mmCIF file of N, CA and C in Angstrom:
data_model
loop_
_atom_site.group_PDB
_atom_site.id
_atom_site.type_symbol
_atom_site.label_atom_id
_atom_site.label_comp_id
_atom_site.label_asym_id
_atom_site.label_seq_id
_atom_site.Cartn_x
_atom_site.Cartn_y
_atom_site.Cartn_z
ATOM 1 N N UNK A 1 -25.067 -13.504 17.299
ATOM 2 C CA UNK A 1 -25.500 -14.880 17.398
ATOM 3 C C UNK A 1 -24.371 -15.773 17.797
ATOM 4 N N UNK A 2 -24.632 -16.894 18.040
ATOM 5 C CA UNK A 2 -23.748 -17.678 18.491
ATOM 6 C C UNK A 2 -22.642 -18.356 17.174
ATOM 7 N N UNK A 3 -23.500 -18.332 16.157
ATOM 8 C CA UNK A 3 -23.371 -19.035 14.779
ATOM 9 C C UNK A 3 -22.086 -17.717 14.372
ATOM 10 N N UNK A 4 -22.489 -16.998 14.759
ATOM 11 C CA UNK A 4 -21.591 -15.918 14.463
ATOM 12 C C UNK A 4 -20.185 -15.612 14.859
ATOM 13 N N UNK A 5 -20.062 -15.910 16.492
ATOM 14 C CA UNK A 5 -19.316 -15.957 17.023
ATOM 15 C C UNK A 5 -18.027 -17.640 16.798
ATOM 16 N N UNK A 6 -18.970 -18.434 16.234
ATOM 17 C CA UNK A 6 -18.608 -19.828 16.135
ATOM 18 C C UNK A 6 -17.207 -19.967 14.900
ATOM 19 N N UNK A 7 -18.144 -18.869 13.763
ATOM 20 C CA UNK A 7 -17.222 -18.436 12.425
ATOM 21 C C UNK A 7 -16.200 -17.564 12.568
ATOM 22 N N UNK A 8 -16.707 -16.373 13.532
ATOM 23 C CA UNK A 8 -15.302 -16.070 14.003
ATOM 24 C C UNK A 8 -14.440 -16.684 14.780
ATOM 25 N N UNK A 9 -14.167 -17.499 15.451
ATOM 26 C CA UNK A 9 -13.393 -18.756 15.985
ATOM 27 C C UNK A 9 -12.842 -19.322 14.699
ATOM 28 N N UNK A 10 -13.681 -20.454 14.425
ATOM 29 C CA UNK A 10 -12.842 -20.377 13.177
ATOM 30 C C UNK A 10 -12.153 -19.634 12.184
ATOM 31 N N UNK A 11 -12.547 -18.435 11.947
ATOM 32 C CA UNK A 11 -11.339 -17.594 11.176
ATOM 33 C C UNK A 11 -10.062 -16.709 11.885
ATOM 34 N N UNK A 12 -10.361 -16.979 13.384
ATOM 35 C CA UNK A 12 -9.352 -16.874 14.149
ATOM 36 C C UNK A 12 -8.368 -17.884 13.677
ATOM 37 N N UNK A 13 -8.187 -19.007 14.149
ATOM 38 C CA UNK A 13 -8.063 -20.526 14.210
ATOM 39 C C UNK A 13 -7.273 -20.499 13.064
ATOM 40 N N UNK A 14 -7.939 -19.984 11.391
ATOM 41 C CA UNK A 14 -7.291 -20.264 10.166
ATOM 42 C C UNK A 14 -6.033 -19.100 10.432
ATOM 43 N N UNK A 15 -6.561 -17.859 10.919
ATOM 44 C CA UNK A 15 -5.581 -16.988 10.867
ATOM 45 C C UNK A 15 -4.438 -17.319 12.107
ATOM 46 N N UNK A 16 -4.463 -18.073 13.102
ATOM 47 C CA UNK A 16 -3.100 -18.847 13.301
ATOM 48 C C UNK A 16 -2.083 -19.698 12.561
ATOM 49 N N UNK A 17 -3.056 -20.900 11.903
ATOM 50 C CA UNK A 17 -2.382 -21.476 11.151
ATOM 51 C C UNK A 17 -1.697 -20.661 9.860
ATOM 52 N N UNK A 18 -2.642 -19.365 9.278
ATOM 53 C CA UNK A 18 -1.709 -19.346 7.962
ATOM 54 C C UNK A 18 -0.589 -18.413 9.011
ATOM 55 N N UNK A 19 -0.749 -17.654 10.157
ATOM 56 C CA UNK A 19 0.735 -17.202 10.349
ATOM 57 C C UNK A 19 1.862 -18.286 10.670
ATOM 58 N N UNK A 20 1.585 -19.090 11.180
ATOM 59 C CA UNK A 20 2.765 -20.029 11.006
ATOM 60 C C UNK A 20 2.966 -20.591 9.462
ATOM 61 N N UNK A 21 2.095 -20.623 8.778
ATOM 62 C CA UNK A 21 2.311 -20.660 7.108
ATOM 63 C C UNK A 21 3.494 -19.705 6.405
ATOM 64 N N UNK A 22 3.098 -18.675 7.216
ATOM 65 C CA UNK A 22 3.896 -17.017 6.446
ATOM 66 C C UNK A 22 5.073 -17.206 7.300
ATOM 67 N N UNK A 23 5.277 -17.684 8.413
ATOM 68 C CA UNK A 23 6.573 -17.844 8.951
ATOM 69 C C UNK A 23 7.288 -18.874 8.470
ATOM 70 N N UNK A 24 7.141 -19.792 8.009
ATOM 71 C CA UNK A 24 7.983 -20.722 7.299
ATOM 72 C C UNK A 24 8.239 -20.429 5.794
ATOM 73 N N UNK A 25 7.184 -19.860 5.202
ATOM 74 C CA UNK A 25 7.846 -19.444 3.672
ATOM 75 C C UNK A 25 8.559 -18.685 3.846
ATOM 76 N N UNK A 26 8.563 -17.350 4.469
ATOM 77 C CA UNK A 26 9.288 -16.274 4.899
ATOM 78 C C UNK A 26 10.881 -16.851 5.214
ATOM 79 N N UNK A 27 10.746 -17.538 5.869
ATOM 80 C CA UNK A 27 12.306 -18.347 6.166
ATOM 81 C C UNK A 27 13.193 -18.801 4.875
ATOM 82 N N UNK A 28 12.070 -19.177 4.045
ATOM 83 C CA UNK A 28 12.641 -19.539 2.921
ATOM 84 C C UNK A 28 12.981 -18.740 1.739
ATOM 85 N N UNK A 29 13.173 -17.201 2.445
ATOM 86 C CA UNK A 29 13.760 -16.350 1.716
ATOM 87 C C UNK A 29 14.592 -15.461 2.222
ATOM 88 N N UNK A 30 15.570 -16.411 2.707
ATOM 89 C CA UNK A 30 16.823 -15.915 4.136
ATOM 90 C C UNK A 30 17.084 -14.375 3.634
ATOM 91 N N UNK A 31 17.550 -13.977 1.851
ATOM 92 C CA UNK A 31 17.920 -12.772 1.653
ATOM 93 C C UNK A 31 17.192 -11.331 1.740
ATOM 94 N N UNK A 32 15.631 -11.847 2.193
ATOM 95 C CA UNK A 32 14.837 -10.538 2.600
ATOM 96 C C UNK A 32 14.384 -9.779 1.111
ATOM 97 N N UNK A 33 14.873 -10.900 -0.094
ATOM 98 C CA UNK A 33 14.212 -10.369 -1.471
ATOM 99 C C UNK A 33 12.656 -9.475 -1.721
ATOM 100 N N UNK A 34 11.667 -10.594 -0.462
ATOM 101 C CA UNK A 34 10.087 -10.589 -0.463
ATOM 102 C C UNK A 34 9.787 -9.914 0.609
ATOM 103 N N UNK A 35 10.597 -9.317 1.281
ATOM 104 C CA UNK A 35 10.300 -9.041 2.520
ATOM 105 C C UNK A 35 9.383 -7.908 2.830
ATOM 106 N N UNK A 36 9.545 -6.877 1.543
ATOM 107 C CA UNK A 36 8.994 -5.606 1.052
ATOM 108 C C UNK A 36 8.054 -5.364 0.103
ATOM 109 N N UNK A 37 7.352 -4.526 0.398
ATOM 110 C CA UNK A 37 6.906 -3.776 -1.147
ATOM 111 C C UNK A 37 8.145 -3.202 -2.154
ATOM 112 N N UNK A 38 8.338 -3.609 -3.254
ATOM 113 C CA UNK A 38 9.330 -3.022 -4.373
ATOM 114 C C UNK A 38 8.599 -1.403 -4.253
ATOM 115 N N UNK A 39 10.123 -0.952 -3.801
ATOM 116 C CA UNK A 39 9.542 0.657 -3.878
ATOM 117 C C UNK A 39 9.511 1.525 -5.302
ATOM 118 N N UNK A 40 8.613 2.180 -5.438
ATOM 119 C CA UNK A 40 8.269 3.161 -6.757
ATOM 120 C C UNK A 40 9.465 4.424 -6.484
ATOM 121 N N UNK A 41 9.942 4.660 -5.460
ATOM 122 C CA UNK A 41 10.844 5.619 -5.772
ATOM 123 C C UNK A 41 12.460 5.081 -6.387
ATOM 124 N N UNK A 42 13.062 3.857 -6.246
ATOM 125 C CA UNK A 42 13.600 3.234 -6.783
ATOM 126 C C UNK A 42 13.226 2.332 -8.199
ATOM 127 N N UNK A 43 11.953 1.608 -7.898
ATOM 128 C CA UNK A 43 11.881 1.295 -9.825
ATOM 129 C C UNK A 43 10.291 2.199 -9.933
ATOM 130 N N UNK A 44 11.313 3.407 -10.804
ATOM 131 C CA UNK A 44 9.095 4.257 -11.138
ATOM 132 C C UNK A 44 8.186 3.647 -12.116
ATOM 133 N N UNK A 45 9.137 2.769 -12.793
ATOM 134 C CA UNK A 45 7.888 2.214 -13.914
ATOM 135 C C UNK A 45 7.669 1.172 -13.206
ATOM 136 N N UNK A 46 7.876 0.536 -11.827
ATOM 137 C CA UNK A 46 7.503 -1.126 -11.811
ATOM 138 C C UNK A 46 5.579 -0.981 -11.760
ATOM 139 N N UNK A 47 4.759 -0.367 -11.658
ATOM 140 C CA UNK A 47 3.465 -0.204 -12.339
ATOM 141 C C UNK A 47 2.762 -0.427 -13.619
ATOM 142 N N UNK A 48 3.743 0.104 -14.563
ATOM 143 C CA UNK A 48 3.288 -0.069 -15.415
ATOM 144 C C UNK A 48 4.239 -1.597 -15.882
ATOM 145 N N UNK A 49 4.580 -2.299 -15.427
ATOM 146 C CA UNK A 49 4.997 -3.616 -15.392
ATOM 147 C C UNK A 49 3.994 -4.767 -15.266
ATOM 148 N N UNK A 50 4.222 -4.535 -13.444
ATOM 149 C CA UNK A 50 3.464 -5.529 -12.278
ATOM 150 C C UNK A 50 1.877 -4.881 -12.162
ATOM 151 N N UNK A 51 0.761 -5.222 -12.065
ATOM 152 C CA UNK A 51 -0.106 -5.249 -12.191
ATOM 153 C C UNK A 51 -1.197 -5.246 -10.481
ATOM 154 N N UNK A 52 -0.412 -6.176 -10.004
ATOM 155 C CA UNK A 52 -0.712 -6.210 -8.421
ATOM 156 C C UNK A 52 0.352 -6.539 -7.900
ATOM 157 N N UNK A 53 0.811 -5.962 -7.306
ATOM 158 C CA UNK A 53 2.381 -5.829 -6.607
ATOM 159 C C UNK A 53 1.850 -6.704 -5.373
ATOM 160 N N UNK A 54 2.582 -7.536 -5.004
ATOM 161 C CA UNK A 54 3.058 -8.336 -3.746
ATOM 162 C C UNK A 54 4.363 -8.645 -2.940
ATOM 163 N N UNK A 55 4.121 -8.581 -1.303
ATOM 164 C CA UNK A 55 5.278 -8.824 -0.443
ATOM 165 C C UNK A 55 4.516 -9.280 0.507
ATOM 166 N N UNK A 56 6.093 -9.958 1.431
ATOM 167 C CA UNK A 56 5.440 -11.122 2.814
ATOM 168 C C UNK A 56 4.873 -9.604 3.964
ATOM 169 N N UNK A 57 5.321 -8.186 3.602
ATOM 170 C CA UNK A 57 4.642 -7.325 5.041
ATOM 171 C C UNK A 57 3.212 -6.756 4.673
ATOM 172 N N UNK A 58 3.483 -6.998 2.808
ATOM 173 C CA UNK A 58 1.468 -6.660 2.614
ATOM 174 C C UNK A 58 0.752 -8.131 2.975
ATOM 175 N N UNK A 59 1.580 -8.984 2.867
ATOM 176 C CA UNK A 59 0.417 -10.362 2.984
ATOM 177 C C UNK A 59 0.405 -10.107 5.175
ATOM 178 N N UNK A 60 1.227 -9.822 5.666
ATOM 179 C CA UNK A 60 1.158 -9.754 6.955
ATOM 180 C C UNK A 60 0.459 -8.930 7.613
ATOM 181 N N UNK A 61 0.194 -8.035 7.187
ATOM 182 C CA UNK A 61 -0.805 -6.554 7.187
ATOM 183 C C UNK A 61 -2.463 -7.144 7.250
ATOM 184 N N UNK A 62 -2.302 -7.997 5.740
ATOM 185 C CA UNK A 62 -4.134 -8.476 5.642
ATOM 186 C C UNK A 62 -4.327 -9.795 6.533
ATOM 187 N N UNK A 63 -3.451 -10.231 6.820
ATOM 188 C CA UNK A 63 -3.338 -11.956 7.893
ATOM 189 C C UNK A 63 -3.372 -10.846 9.164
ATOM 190 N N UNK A 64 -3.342 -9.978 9.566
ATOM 191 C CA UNK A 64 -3.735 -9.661 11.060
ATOM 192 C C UNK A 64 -4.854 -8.627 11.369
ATOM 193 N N UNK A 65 -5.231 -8.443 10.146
ATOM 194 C CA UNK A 65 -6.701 -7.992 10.206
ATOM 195 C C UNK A 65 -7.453 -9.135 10.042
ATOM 196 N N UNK A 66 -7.130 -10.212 10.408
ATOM 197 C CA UNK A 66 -8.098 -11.126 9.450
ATOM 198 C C UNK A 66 -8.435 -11.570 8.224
ATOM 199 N N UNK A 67 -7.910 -10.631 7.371
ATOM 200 C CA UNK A 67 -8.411 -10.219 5.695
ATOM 201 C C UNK A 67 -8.064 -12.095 4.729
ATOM 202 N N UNK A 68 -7.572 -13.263 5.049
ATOM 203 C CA UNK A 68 -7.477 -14.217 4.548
ATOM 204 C C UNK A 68 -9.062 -14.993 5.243
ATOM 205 N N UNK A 69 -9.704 -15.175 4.126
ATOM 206 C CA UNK A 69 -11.046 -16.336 4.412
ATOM 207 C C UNK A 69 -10.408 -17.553 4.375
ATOM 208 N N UNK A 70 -10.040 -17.754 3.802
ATOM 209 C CA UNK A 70 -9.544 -19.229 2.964
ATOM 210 C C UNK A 70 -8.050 -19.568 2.903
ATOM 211 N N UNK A 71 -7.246 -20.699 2.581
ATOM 212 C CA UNK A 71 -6.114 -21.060 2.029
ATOM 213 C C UNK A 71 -6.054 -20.191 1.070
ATOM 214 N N UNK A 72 -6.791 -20.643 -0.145
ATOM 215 C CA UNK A 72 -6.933 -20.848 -0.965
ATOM 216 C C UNK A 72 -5.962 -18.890 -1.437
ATOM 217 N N UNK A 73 -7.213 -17.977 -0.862
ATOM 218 C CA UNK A 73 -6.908 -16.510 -1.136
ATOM 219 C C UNK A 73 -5.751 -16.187 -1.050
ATOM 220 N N UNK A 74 -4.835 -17.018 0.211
ATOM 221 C CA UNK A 74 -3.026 -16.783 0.627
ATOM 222 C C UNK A 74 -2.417 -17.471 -0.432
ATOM 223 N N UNK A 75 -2.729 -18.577 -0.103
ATOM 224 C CA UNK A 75 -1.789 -18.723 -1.739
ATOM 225 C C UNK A 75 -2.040 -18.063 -3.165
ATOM 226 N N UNK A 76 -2.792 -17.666 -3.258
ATOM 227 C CA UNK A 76 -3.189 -16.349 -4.098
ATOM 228 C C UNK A 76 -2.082 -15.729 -4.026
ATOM 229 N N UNK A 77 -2.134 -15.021 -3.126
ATOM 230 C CA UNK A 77 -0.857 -13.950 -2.775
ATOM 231 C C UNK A 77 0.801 -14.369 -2.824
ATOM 232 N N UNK A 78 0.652 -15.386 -1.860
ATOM 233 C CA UNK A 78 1.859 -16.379 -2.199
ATOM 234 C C UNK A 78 2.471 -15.902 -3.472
ATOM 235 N N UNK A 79 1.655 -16.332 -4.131
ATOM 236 C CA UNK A 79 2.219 -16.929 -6.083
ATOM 237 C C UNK A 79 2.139 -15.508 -6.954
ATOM 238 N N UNK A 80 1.366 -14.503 -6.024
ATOM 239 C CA UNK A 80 2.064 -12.926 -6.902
ATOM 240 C C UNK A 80 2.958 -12.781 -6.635
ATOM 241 N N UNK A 81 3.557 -12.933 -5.214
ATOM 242 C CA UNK A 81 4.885 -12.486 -4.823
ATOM 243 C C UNK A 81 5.829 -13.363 -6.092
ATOM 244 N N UNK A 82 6.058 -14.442 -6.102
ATOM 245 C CA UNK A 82 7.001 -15.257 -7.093
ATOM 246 C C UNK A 82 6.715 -15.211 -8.896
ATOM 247 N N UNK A 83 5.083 -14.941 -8.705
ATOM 248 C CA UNK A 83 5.189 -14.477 -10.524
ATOM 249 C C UNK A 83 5.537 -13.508 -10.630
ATOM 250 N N UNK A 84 5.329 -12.072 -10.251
ATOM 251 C CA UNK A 84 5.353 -10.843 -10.511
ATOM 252 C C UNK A 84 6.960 -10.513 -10.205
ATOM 253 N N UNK A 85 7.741 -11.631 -9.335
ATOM 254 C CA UNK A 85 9.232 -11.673 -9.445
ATOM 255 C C UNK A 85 9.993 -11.968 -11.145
ATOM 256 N N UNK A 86 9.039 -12.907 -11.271
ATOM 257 C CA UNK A 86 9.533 -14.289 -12.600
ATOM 258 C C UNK A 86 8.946 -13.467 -13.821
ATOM 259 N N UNK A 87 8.751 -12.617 -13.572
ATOM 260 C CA UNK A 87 8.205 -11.247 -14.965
ATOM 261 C C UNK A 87 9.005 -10.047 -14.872
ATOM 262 N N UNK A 88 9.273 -9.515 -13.941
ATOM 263 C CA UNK A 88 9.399 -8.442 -13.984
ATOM 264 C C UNK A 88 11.121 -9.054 -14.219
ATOM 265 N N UNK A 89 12.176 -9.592 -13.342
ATOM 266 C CA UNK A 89 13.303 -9.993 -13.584
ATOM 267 C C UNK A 89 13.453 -10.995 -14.551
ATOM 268 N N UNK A 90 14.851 -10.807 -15.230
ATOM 269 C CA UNK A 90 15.167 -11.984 -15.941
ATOM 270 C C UNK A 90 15.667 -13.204 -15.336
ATOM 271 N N UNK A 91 15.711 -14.177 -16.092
ATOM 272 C CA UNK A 91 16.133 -15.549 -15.395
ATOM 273 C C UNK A 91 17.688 -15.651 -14.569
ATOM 274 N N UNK A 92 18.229 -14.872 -15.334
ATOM 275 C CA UNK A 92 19.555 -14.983 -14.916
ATOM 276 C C UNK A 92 20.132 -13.894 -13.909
ATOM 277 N N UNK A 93 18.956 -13.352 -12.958
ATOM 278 C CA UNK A 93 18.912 -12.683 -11.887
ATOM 279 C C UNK A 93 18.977 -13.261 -10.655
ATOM 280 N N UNK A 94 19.516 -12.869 -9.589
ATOM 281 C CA UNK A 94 19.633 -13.099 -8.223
ATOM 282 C C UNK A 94 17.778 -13.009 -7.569
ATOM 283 N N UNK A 95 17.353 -12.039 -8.288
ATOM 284 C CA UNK A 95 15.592 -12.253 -8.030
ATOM 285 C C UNK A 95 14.767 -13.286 -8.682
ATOM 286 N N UNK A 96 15.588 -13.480 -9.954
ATOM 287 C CA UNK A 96 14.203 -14.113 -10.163
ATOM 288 C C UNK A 96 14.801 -16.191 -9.784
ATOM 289 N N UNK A 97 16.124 -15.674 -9.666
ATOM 290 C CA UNK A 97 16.590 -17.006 -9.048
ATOM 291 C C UNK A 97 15.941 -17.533 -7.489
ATOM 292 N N UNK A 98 16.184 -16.655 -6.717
ATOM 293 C CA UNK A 98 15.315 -16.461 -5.276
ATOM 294 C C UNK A 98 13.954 -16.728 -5.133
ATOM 295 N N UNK A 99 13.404 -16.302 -6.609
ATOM 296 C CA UNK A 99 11.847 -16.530 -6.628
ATOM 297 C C UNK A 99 11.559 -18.120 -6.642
ATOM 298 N N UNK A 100 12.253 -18.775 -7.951
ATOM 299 C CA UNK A 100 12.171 -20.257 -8.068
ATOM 300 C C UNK A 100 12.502 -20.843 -6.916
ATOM 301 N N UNK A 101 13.513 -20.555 -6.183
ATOM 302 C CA UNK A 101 14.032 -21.340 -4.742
ATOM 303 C C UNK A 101 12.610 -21.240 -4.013
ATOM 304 N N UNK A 102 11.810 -20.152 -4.040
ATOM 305 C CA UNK A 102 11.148 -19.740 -3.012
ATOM 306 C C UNK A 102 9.760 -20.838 -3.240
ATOM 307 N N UNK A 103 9.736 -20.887 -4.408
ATOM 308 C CA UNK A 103 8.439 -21.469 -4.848
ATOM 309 C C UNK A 103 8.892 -22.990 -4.273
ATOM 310 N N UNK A 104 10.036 -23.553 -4.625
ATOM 311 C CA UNK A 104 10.139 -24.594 -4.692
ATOM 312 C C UNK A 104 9.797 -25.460 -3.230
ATOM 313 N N UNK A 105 10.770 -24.782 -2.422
ATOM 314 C CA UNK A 105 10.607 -24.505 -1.161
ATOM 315 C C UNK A 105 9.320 -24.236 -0.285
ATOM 316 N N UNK A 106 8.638 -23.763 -0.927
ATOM 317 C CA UNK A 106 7.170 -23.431 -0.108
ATOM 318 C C UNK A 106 6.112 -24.339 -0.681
ATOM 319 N N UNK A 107 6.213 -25.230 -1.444
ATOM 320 C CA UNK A 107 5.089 -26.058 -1.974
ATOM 321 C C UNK A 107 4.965 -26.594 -1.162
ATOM 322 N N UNK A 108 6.765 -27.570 -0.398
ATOM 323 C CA UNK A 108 6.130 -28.413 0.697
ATOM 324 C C UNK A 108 5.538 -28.053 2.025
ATOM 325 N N UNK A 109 5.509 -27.156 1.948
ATOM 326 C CA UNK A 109 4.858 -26.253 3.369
ATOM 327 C C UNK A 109 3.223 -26.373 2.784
ATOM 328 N N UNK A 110 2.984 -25.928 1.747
ATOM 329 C CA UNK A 110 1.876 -25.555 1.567
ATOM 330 C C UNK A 110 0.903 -26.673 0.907
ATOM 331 N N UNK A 111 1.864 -27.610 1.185
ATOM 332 C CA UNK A 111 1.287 -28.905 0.288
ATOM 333 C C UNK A 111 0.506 -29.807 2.270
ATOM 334 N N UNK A 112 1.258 -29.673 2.841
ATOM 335 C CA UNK A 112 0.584 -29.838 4.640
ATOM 336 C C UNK A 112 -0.270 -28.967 4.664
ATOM 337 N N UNK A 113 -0.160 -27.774 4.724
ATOM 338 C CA UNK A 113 -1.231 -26.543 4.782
ATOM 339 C C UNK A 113 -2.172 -27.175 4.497
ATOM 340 N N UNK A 114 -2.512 -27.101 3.638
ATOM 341 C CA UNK A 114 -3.969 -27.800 2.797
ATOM 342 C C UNK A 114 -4.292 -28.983 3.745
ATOM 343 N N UNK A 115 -3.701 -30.062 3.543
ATOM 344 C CA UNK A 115 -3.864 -30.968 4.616
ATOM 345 C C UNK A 115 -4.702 -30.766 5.729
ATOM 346 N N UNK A 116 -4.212 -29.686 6.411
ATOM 347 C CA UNK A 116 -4.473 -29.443 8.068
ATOM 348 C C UNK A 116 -5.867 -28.596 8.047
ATOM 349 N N UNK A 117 -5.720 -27.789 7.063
ATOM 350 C CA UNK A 117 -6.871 -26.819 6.757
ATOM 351 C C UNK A 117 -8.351 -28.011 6.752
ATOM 352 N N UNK A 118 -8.050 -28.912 5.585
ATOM 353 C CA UNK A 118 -8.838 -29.361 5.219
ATOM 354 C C UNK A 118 -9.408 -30.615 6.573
ATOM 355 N N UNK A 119 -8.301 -31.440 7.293
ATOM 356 C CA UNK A 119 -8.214 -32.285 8.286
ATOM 357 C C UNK A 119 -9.043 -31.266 9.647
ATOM 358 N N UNK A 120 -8.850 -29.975 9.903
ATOM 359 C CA UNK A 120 -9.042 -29.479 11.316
ATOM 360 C C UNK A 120 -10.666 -29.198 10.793
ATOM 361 N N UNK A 121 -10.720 -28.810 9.171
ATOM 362 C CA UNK A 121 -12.201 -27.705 8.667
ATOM 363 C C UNK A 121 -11.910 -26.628 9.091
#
């Protein structure tokens, strides 16, 4: 249908904007902390820790299949990457320090996001 084709446009459309979303938070973690999945052959218990493990190449994986409907679901993801940092490390870590920078840093990105999302529909 046409109605069909109309929604996929638009979730094209969103999935531009959040990659320029993921490219600017991404920046804001010059040391490549988030850049990964935390590997299980280096920490074997981080499972029985972290609960849903998050990084910027799994959120990049589901942003080019399409797999984000909404803002709303990315920042979802967003905020595992930085809680599941802010749990698993202590405060007085180079990670979980990186995490707070990261958050801090990406609100104002994501504080326009919303904006534009909501301004374009």
């Amino acid at each position: 249908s046409m109605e069909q084709v109309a929604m996929e446009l638009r979730l094209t459309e969103l999935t531009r904007l959040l990659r320029s979303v993921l490219d600017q938070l991404q920046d804001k973690d010059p040391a490549r902390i988030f850049a990964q999945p935390v590997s299980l052959k280096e920490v074997p218990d981080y499972l029985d820790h972290i609960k849903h493990p998050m990084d910027f190449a799994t959120m990049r994986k589901r942003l080019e299949a399409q797999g984000y409907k909404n803002l709303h679901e990315f920042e979802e993801d967003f905020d595992l990457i930085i809680d599941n940092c802010m749990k698993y490390n202590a405060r007085d870590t180079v990670f979980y320090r990186a995490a707070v920078r990261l958050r801090d840093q990406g609100g104002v990105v994501l504080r326009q996001a919303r904006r534009e999302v909501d301004s374009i529909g």
